[PDB]
Amino acid sequence: SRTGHTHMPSVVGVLVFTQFWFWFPLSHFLSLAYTPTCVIGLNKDLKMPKVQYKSNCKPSTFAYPAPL
Amino acid sequence: PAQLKVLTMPETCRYQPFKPLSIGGIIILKDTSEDIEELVEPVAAHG
Amino acid sequence: PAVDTAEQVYISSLALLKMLKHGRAGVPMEVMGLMLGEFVDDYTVRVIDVFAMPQSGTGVSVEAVDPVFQAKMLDMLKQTGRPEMVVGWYHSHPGFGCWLSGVDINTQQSFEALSERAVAVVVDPIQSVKGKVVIDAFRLINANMMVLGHEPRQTTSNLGHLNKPSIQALIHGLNRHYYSITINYRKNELEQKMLLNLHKKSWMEGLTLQDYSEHCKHNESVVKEMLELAKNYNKAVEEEDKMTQDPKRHLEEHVDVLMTSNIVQCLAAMLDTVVFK
Amino acid sequence: LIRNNNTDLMILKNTKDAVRNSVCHTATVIANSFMHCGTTSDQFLRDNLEWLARATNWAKFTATASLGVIHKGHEKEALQLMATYLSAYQEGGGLYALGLIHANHGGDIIDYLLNQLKNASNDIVRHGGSLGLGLAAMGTARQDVYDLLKTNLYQDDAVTGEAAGLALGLVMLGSKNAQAIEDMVGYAQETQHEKIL
Amino acid sequence: IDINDVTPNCRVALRNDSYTLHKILPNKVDPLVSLMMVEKVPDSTYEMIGG
Amino acid sequence: EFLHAQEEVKRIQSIPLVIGQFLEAVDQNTAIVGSTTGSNYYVRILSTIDRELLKPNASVALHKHSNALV
Ligand SMILES: [Zn+2]
Numbered sequence: 001s002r003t004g005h006t007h008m009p010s011v012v013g014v015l016v017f018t019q020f021w022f023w024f025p026l027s028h029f030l031s032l033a034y035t036p037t038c039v040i041g042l043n044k045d046l047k048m049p050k051v052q053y054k055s056n057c058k059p060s061t062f063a064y065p066a067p068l
Numbered sequence: 069p070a071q072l073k074v075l076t077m078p079e080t081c082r083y084q085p086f087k088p089l090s091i092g093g094i095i096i097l098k099d100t101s102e103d104i105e106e107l108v109e110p111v112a113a114h115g
Numbered sequence: 116p117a118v119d120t121a122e123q124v125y126i127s128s129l130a131l132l133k134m135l136k137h138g139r140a141g142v143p144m145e146v147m148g149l150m151l152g153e154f155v156d157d158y159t160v161r162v163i164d165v166f167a168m169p170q171s172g173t174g175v176s177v178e179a180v181d182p183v184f185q186a187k188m189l190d191m192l193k194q195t196g197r198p199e200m201v202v203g204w205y206h207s208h209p210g211f212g213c214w215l216s217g218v219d220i221n222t223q224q225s226f227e228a229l230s231e232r233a234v235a236v237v238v239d240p241i242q243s244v245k246g247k248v249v250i251d252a253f254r255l256i257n258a259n260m261m262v263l264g265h266e267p268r269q270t271t272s273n274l275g276h277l278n279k280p281s282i283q284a285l286i287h288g289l290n291r292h293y294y295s296i297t298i299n300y301r302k303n304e305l306e307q308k309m310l311l312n313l314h315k316k317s318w319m320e321g322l323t324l325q326d327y328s329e330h331c332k333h334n335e336s337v338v339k340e341m342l343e344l345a346k347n348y349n350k351a352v353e354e355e356d357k358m359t360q361d362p363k364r365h366l367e368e369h370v371d372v373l374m375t376s377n378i379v380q381c382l383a384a385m386l387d388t389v390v391f392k
Numbered sequence: 393l394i395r396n397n398n399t400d401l402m403i404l405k406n407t408k409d410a411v412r413n414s415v416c417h418t419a420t421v422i423a424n425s426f427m428h429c430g431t432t433s434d435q436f437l438r439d440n441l442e443w444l445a446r447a448t449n450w451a452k453f454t455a456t457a458s459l460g461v462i463h464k465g466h467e468k469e470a471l472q473l474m475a476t477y478l479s480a481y482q483e484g485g486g487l488y489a490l491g492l493i494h495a496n497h498g499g500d501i502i503d504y505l506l507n508q509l510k511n512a513s514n515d516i517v518r519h520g521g522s523l524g525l526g527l528a529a530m531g532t533a534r535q536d537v538y539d540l541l542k543t544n545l546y547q548d549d550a551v552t553g554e555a556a557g558l559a560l561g562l563v564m565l566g567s568k569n570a571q572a573i574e575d576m577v578g579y580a581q582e583t584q585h586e587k588i589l
Numbered sequence: 590i591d592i593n594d595v596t597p598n599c600r601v602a603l604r605n606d607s608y609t610l611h612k613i614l615p616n617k618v619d620p621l622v623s624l625m626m627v628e629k630v631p632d633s634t635y636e637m638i639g640g
Numbered sequence: 641e642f643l644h645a646q647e648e649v650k651r652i653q654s655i656p657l658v659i660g661q662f663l664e665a666v667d668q669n670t671a672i673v674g675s676t677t678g679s680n681y682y683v684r685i686l687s688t689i690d691r692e693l694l695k696p697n698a699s700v701a702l703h704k705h706s707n708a709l710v
Pocket residue numbers: 145175206207208215216218219
């Protein structure tokens with residue numbers, strides 16, 4: 001996880017997915033290994049308020065891929 | 069995740085991070101100024 | 116309900132030995148026999164044992180099944196304590212690779228009609244030379260499915276594949292008319308030990324001494340060959356250095372054989388001379 | 393994710409056009425599942441119906457599981473959503489997809505999955521429900537769930553036994569339950585199905 | 590392989606029992622005529638001839 | 641594991657081989673042979689057969705089924 005603790009859902013999903021060689025239906029287990037790369041701001045009311053973050057880098061190194 | 073060591077907010081707006089924008093995930097942005105405090109709409113879950 | 120490409124035939128060690136023995140015990144004839152075993156659930160064909168069939172004269176075909184013989188031995192083995200159904204049939208194709216001919220397809224079709232999960236096993240005694248056991252297992256495909264276009268055999272797991280189908284079988288219809296099945300072997304530890312007993316070396320052999328006269332003669336042969344190789348090695352290295360291998364490799368082999376043989380015999384000599392007194 | 397659902401569809405369309413085999417077909421199914429995972433958007437599947445209809449046998453199971461993964465994290469419309477989306481492979485895949493939607497955080501739907509797995513008739517539905525229950529109860533170590541999964545394992549059928557074992561592992565995850573270890577190891581040493589192994 | 594590479598009259602290898610052209614062997618040269626070609630020049634020289 | 645490999649090589653280099661005539665060296669570890677059976681094949685040369693000693697139209701011995709210039 002973001003702090004350092006081993007992410008049990010992630011490890012379980014990765015292991016079971018790797019165990020697809022013997023059973024394709026297990027391939028979906030990897031779904032558990034996805035961690036949303038989101039930094040979400042929340043306030044006292046617990047309702048996500050409109051806020052603007054600033055990052056100091058070019059708008060090319062972390063942007064979505066070209067649409068092709 | 070590499071783009072977390074360098075991440076902040078402009079001119080320290082009404083919302084100030086509780087913990088620096090390096091751990092990431094979810095942050096309880098403390099509020100100082102009182103205003104309308106417009107929320108973000110709950111978009112429908114179909115795409 | 117379509118068979119997937121994970122079904123596997125677990126041929127017992129006894130079954131394999133009997134099959135190969137019969138093939139080489141009747142080559143060049145197309146020997147035939149039944150395969151007694153038990154389908155487990157849907158993806159296994161556990162061939163416990165095989166079943167030699169008398170030479171029927173008419174090559175290999177349904178006419179060679181001899182139902183009276185088949186049934187009577189079935190009952191008699193069941194009495195002995197071997198109650199298994201007739202899972203598939205094996206028959207050899209001496210020299211001519213592994214695949215099914217027209218008569219083979221007809222016989223396999225009859226077997227499938229009797230029970231549509233049996234198999235047809237092909238063994239080639241001539242090409243199953245030392246170190247290579249060229250055996251194959253096959254089952255037929257249905258014309259209705261083939262015309263419909265749906266693949267003959269489902270693929271739910273990465274197993275079943277991992278094998279390169281022989282071009283011989285491709286030509287003879289490895290997919291147009293039938294399809295191959297993976298062959299696994301149920302090697303029990305006890306059977307593996309009893310097989311090891313074949314070439315297992317007795318303690319006499321282990322602790323004996325090689326003849327000293329022959330030992331000296333072999334040492335001389337190898338040492339003289341090593342001398343010649345050393346001359347060639349010098350020539351090669353000198354010419355290489357002046358300008359700026361096989362002799363070195365042969366020299367290494369000869370030195371290794373000399374060292375191992377001499378040390379082995381000397382140690383055995385001491386073991387014997389202070390064990391037997 | 394739904395807000396930042398900036399997926400790409402025409403690359404998937406190109407792969408779909410390039411597919412010829414069932415293996416590649418299910419590969420595209422799973423790839424679309426991954427691409428839309430956590431997005432709850434099933435545009436590609438809801439568009440290419442004939443493509444889904446081409447799926448046969450366990451491909452249907454995999455496709456329904458893909459739908460579940462796409463609807464990962466979407467627990468408000470569960471039950472009714474899966475009923476609306478709708479053979480034995482279809483039902484098993486639906487149960488497994490519901491289990492995947494209700495990931496490690498299970499809870500309410502544990503009793504649901506348990507009841508359907510209990511009163512599931514076909515071994516394929518048993519397999520799907522067992523996998524879904526394993527997903528839902530992963531780490532919870534619920535004794536009732538473990539007992540039901542052990543009962544579903546104590547048979548002789550690869551399709552049921554594989555899912556039963558995997559679900560037993562998921563539910564007993566980390567608990568180190570010595571009784572569970574003994575039971576599963578004994579059944580492994582005694583059974584006669586490599587897939588159950 | 591290419592058709593423009595298998596332009597006529599060139600030895601080509603064929604896979605067994607399938608006869609699938611899969612190589613461009615060197616142009617045919619009959620054995621017992623291949624060896625009719627001086628590979629090691631004799632040691633004679635015009636300096637060894639007088640008159 | 642490297643052992644058993646020399647063994648399998650020496651075993652494929654068996655006794656019942658068939659004699660033939662090595663016609664030309666198409667490329668490294670491969671060549672054209674003509675088996676005394678009366679037909680020409682494009683077969684694979686084993687390793688360590690002294691390519692220097694493998695001159696055109698020489699007498700070679702081939703595997704009985706693979707026809708490799710053993
Ligand atoms: Zn035959």
